Amino acid sequence: RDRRERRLIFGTIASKMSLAPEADLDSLIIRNDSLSGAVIAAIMQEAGLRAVRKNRYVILQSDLEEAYATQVKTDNTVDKFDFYK
């Protein structure tokens, strides 16, 4: 992927959802590496799932960052080096 090329996915999903003006879209394109639109769409969708937990219809910057750490990796077996080979 590319930093600017992925932004087409970020900007498209963000147009169909409500986001605060303090939300930084450049922090997602730099940190994410080799990911598809399905993972990106789950980030903005989790932001709404984190918003309904707080009973706030407007997604703020806090709900955007808290939703990124959950959807960044779906693999539970990662660990780090714990099991060699």
Partner 1 sequence: GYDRHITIFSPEGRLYQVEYAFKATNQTNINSLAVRGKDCTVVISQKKVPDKLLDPTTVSYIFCISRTIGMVVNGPIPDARNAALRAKAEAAEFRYKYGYDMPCDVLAKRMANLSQIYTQRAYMRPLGVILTFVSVDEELGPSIYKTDPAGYYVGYKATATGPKQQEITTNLENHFKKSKIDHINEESWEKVVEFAITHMIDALGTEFSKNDLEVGVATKDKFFTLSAENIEERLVAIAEQ
Partner 2 sequence: EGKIDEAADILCELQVETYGSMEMSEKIQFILEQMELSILKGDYSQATVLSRKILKKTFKNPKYESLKLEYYNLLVKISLHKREYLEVAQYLQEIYQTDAIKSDEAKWKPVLSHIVYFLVLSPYGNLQNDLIHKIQNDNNLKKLESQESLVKLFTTNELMRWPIVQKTYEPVLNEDDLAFGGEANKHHWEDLQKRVIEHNLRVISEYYSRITLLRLNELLDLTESQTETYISDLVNQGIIYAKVNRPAKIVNFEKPKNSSQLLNEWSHNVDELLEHIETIGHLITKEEIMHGL
Residues of the shown chain interacting with partner 1 in the complex, contacts defined by CB under 8 A: 82-85
Minimum distance, C-beta of residue 70 to partner 1, in the bound complex (Å): 18
d(CA 37, CA 21): 22
What does the per-residue mask of binding to partner 2 show for 6-45, with x meaning CB under 8 A?
----------------------------------------
Query: Binding partner 2 by CB under 8 A: which of 4, 15, 16, 58?
Result: 58
Minimum distance, C-beta of residue 54 to partner 2, in the bound complex (Å): 8
SS3 labels along the chain = CCHHHHHHHHHHHHHCCCECCCCCCHHHHHHCCCCCHHHHHHHHHHHHHHHHHCCCCCECHHHHHHHHHHHCCCCCCCCCCCCCC
Query: Binding partner 2 by CB under 8 A: which of 33, 57, 76, 85?
Result: 57
User: Binding residues for partner 2, per CB under 8 A?
Assistant: 55-58
